[PDB]
Structures are given as structure tokens and as C-alpha cells.
Design a binder for this molecule. Sequence first.
Ligand SMILES: [Cl-]
Ligand SMILES: [Zn+2]
Length: 226
Amino acid sequence: VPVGTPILQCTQPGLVALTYDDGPFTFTPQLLDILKQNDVRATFFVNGNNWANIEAGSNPDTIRRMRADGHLVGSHTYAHPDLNTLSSADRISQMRQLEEATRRIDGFAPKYMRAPYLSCDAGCQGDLGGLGYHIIDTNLDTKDYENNKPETTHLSAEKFNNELSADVGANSYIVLSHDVHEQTVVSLTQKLIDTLKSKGYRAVTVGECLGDAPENWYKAHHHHHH
Ligand SMILES: [Cl-]
Ligand SMILES: [Zn+2]
């Protein structure tokens, strides 16, 4: 799987990787329950301290359930800054801080990440590559953060349907949603699953989307010497 270079689609067609950024937060437990009931795995790009602290409250338990249920856990940086705007030392710190938290939680560090605001240019990419990260972008943005009211979430479900080509054999998608919005969880997610199966796609983690064995998704161990 490419390192230090933004990835937009799967390595095979007929696949959808549903992804969720900016958690974990209030609605994430319910989202895990919904995905389980659907037998669907997904991918979470998590922060360390953004809408909540990943080590506060039940969040450590939600992160542990993500892994237990087979969802891919990726980094979204610790504090959600625009990585372009930081010096290399500060970008390295944003990644390592999150890795230290996920190691405290469940003894892992992500090899997968997504840049806040999809903002990560060649300067940023070089550093992330030196850290051995896979950079995950999107080729289908639900705009769920804009369509986040009971009466407007259908616009995001429609956007998904519109963009999801009926031509299952020639296409695959990495889908951007944000589970920190209640409507993303209690309405949009079921519609995404329904719509993707109605067209013949299979939902997959980004790991499977890119042909990557789950044994490669994480650094299972800290190297004492770098
Ligand atoms: Cl290093
Ligand atoms: Zn974000």
C-alpha cells in the first residue's frame, strides 16, 4: 500500500469503504451497533482531543470495540490542525501524540491516516511518508457535516446515490462522512448501506479496499530505537 501519497479509491472495483472522521464522540456507540446489525465493517479516522478526548469517558471502550468488531482504526491527528500550516516537528508530534493515546488504550498505533480538511501537500506528504503513513483521501464526500439536520440529511443520502455509479464493475469509492454528527449515525449510515448493496457494491474497511491484510494495519509495537 502506498506510503506518503494520497489514496482516493480501491485497488479493485465493486467496493465501497465507508469512512468516518472526527470521533469518537456521542453517537459512535450507536454507529457501531448499526454497523454490527448490518454485518458491515467500516473505517474510523479518530482524533485524540477534538469534539471529545479519546481517553475520556467511554471513548477508550468505543475504540476497543472498533477493533474487536474488525473496523479499521486510522489517525486523524491528535488535535485536528491543518497539517500544512505546521513545521515538520509539529506534524510529527500531532501524529505521535495520537499513537501514544491509542497505544495506552489498546496497544496499537495506526499506519493509516487522513489529513484534517484533506489538507496535506507535498511538504506534509514527505513527513507523513517518513513516518510510514498511508494517506487516505476520498473520492465521494457525503457533505454530511453540512446536511446535518433531520430535514436535510436526505440531501447527503441523495448525493451518495447520485455519485455512486450504477457501473459497479468499473468503480470503487472511499466515502467521507463524520460520525460526530448525530444524523450521520441515526439516518445517513443505513441509507448508505442500503444504497451501496442495491447497486451491487460490497462495503469494506479501507484495509480490504487497498488489498492490505489486517496484520499490516497497525504498528503492534513501539521501536525503542528510531
Ligand atoms: Cl522518527
Ligand atoms: Zn476532520
